[PDB]
Ligand binder design. Structure first.
Ligand SMILES: OC[C@H]1O[C@H](O)[C@H](O)[C@@H](O)[C@@H]1O
Ligand SMILES: OC[C@H]1O[C@H](O)[C@H](O)[C@@H](O)[C@@H]1O
Ligand SMILES: OC[C@H]1O[C@H](O)[C@H](O)[C@@H](O)[C@@H]1O
Ligand SMILES: OC[C@H]1O[C@H](O)[C@H](O)[C@@H](O)[C@@H]1O
Ligand SMILES: [Mn+2]
Ligand SMILES: [Mn+2]
Ligand SMILES: [Mn+2]
Ligand SMILES: [Mn+2]
Ligand SMILES: [Mn+2]
Ligand SMILES: [Mn+2]
Ligand SMILES: [Mn+2]
Ligand SMILES: [Mn+2]
Lengths: 384, 384, 384, 384
């Protein structure tokens, strides 16, 4: 279960670089130089790294400092063969973003947010990024009067449409991925789930430029089934990026290493990514717990990739097992994939086997055999 | 706070008619004749009633029995002036639907589900219904192997497209509203939130024929903010129907009377419906608790309408209060409603006030004044 | 992973016998004769069965019918070697219990509840039961005025004290186990968690007669950590019975087979039961999903036991692995088990190494190595 | 609704003094001098203030700095008439506490935690505090192997027993209150609810010295009913302190002002505190949202007290309304308060009206009238 760069495992600089400050706690680790993170990740078998603007270039840097920070990072990438497939903007840390970036009630802050994003898009393209993530973690409210959501969505659409006009004006090939989260740090966040983000994208001027960046833990903070939401994103053709981690239920955003939290959900996720031929980076957005020293940071990062590769092996074994394939037929997964009425509406209306002569009791008596199928899945997951 | 039929309050026959059977309990009330429910609701000031097929006509009825049941119900409507603005199909009670209707793995069950729906659409139109709700409460899974979600969504789209071809072929004016719910009775339900249902509708062949029917409690079973989701539905032009009730958090579907559960959320909901000029029925999907006798059933139904009218008065008083209007300006709700960059992209890029000369510290220091605004809202809600 | 009766696996008659009625659904299976359930469970390797009064003897039975039902069940036990280690009273199904049994507002219902319990205690003792479970599923409220909780707890204490006086008066060896659940079917249930039940027991007249019967899914319906609560019960000496099943988070009570739901929590649970030498029955309180026919019922029951035995093997391998034992020392689990201040208070107060000369920075810099330990645990669970 | 110091409203220095740093955000406000907070709170009508050690004296202060900080705070108290009814130790911010204080796996950290607590107990007594709160926010785990919970509870008991021996040795009148929280910042926190803390206290060497300090939001982060838990604490005689705030469901700890979040729960809470004659401080543990400037901080604090006084008035009006008193009798709240069997066990066993001649159908048919009672409660809350 040794990763190599051809598994396309990627990590945010902010993941391994998290210093361990939490709502109730000071930092437990020193800050990492991005160069060290690139080196250590490469050595673990990662393929690439991702960044917010402010992770690579300290906020408020001079042009000379900006150039120096980028030069050093570029050297580390050259030294290791690491890629930068994705970048993003920090529109949440600085106090000016306390009511949002794109949907801030103050118009001047909205304009600033757009300008800060556009500056970093240019940098992302320079570094070879194919995807630009937007996480509107400050977009939302704690109270009902504070944010008229229809006006906020107008602002959000205006922002995304301006960024799509910008990338089109420059001829860039980069696409956007909107990352949903239901709450935290705002009491409620706008576009709180994969569904809401998909729906919003369809109202943009150039929808083809936008997809989603779903995170395991974020959909689980609403008690939703993450594999199901990923299936709907894939169905829509919108899975442009993914954040892999773990989460134990409905609580604060834990960002556990991938495989921790809901292990069975992790199994079904990998099964779906691999069966669907998802071709994007397997990106980890996780925090090594603050209990850990640096050795533990790298152990946690390595465990992300290990767990993905173990799950990949088990899921593949499940699907290739002739006994599973029989069980799938016994549970009529083959019939689920057939059209209901390829014969057309009038044929269905005239088909007496569909209503007047349908034996509902006989059809109701047929067991679905899902428990046997699921115990096969359990036995494969556990290697039993 | 006395309702009259011109408040457009409506109730499902299954609401007041719930006999009180729960996962762990037998019925505590006798079944109601739909005629009695129409009469009693009319007397309380309701405007109309809604029905599943199987609430009005017992499942398996002969054609003569069907005609008799409809004749009696039509007489009650004529006697009272009650309307039937919405109908729906029961695709969840009968054991044949144990794995779904439209997304059942068995193809024969999918076809049957469509035929049962189309029969009831014809009846709904006969009774004057403008909206047809679909609640896919059996569409989903308890286990990961049982349901390939992409194939299930293909089936779901096929079903909805066939029903849209049917209503178009008949020249009916009726529209569809998809009702999301995240879980219960299935471990996870497909299209689990307002967002997912909105996104799915955009992939239908005739999207204009479909909207959502969001329920207060259902979005709250995912810990989501119901007013926010209603705002996104209104933003999309998709709020075709609404189910009003109460819910205490993330748990089984309680279906409390409206106003119970999250009272502040109820306030913000009414504020939004009324400010947006929502013109559909104020439909209650609630269960009088099984502790209640029939007197308590009608008291609970009356309380639904009372609470809506009290909230309406308080919300209107909030928005009309000059002190609130001042507070709204102090919190920059007026600026949220202004375009970010009506000057256009190039003008924003060239505007040094948006970046190079933006005083981020000064903008960060400006308080949003949201707590004062929210205490005004509290004082108006409580009549303090 | 083949169970035998010496693993002490037990099942409620209501588990495998669940007909599949849910809030929104009719039965999908026929009722089982208890004799058939005893036979089929025995054949799967179960050790025993448990019952509510009303599962073994239909409610309202004559004395002759009662005797016949018990005679047939006794013959099945004799035929198979099955035991009956636990029984319980149904104080939730009948409409008379709509506001509770022991804490019903109506005094006559409280008295009836006690008399129905005492009748079944006598039967439980006749059948050899060592434990009598009380699940107060109707004790609680949907609304704040309906139940004065302090008066309800007085009533609950009075009930339990009367049942303890009864068993003492008869010389029975049976003990009570109170089963917590946080909600469902009541909006909130009294004694909603293991903690609340433990605390309540300490106020009973004969606390030694009462423990807890924690259920995996019930503590997970409050988002709590089930292994932690079981550890507190074991710490208190109060783990008199356990209900094993699965649950996917904060939602309605799913009662999945054991191993489903939170698999990692299941692993840590088995590790704790086995390490602590828990000697009670491994009782499953699960519902075979209503999608299943009878074949699937028995497959689901078999999977309960299989998953326990796989987890037992993996947990034992974890604890016996010298690499894990090293990792445990590296994370200072050995120091957690040492007394903080066996030297006593004055010695601690005078110990300058504990404060004045404690190097807090050096102690803060030491990583806990928990991620490496947890990846060892993951690798053992998965057999990697 | 103007508070005066005789309503006994108190605030933590850390509440109004919160600078607005969150998991994803820098501070939005400058630090407050405790003297300014005392002054501003006094002016709003507060009665007192509470503190962690490290809020009053910066961590690592010299003895001269410690004396100066305490002298200035004492002058502010003298200038205003403010009291200090409660104090607490910060055992969570400093990195040395990353795995806990009292239950840290490192024994040296446990000893340090005790010494830091005992130093502050002496200071609390000097300042007149009657209650000392312990919040074990770092006691717990993110992973199953990291913390053997039975050994951690042994350590926790040892710590609390040593602190009780200390206060007894000094002749202090101060008592302890343990504050539960279910998670955050640890993945799961030990003693996660009011129930678990009550149960644990009964195993201490001097239980009479310990009670609970329940927080509105903390029990709501487990989806529990806060009024119910407060009723159990009052029933046990253990409500030694309370933290008042708001929370919107199962999510991160919001610490909204009191009255925000679950408003109906706030109403039932005040009703219970006032009806039970709770005599402790009405302490607010809230965070003015980081959107706010200092003006908004004081507005938020004022709103805490206003909302309590509005709820107090409405609850009192409810209980004094003859129509409510009639409704309470109609719902048999008077019978709930009567003993079930003051006649004794043998009399109940011989009472044929309790079983053999009990008309269960007649008792089941009697409605509880809870909806009418609850609509009265709603109408009183809203002043309708
Ligand atoms: O910018 C996108 C990233 O930003 C932040 O670090 C969020 O916490 C993380 O979930 C997100 O993936
Ligand atoms: O058909 C739509 C209706 O069906 C059922 O009764 C559902 O429980 C309810 O939420 C839904 O509104
Ligand atoms: O009587 C105790 C048993 O009763 C019921 O069937 C409950 O649903 C179950 O959780 C409980 O274990
Ligand atoms: O010390 C007790 C106090 O400490 C912290 O500030 C906690 O966050 C708060 O809930 C608690 O009341
Ligand atoms: Mn996250
Ligand atoms: Mn992320
Ligand atoms: Mn509902
Ligand atoms: Mn509904
Ligand atoms: Mn259960
Ligand atoms: Mn159980
Ligand atoms: Mn809190
Ligand atoms: Mn607190």
């Amino acid at each position: 279960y040794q990763p190599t760069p051809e598994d396309r495992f990627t990590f945010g600089l902010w993941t391994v670089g998290w210093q361990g400050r939490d709502p109730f706690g000071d930092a437990t680790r020193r800050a990492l130089d991005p160069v060290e993170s690139v080196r250590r990740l490469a050595e673990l078998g990662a393929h690439g790294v991702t960044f917010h603007d402010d992770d690579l270039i300290p906020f408020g840097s001079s042009d000379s400092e900006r150039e120096e920070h980028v030069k050093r990072f570029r050297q580390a990438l050259d030294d290791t063969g690491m890629k930068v497939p994705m970048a993003t903007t920090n529109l949440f840390t600085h106090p000016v973003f306390k009511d949002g970036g794109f949907t801030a009630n103050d118009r001047d802050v909205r304009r600033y947010a757009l300008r800060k994003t556009i500056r970093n898009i240019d940098l992302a393209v320079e570094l070879g990024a194919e995807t630009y993530v937007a996480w509107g973690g400050r977009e939302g409210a704690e109270s009902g009067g504070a944010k008229d959501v229809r006006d906020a969505l107008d602002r959000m659409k205006e922002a995304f449409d301006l960024l799509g006009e910008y990338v089109t004006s420059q001829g860039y090939d980069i696409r956007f991925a909107i990352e949903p989260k239901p709450n935290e740090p705002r009491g409620d966040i706008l576009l709180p789930t994969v569904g809401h983000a998909l729906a919003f994208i369809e109202r943009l001027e150039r929808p083809e430029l936008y997809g989603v960046n779903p995170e395991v833990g974020h959909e689980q903070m609403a008690g939703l089934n993450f594999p199901h939401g990923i299936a709907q994103a894939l169905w829509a053709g919108k899975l442009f990026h993914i954040d892999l981690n773990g989460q134990n239920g409905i609580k604060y955003d834990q960002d556990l290493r991938f495989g921790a939290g809901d292990l069975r959900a992790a199994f079904w996720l990998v099964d779906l990514l691999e069966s669907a031929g998802y071709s994007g980076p397997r990106h980890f957005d996780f925090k090594p717990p603050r209990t850990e020293d640096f050795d533990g940071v790298w152990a946690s990062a390595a465990g992300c990739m290990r767990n993905y590769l173990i799950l990949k092996e088990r899921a593949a074994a499940f699907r290739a097992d002739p006994e599973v394939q029989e069980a799938l037929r016994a549970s009529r997964l083959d019939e689920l994939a057939r059209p209901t009425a390829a014969d057309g509406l009038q044929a269905l209306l005239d088909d007496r086997s569909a209503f007047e002569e349908f034996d509902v009791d006989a059809a109701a008596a047929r067991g679905m055999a899902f428990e046997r199928l699921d115990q096969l899945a359990m036995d494969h997951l556990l290697g039993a």
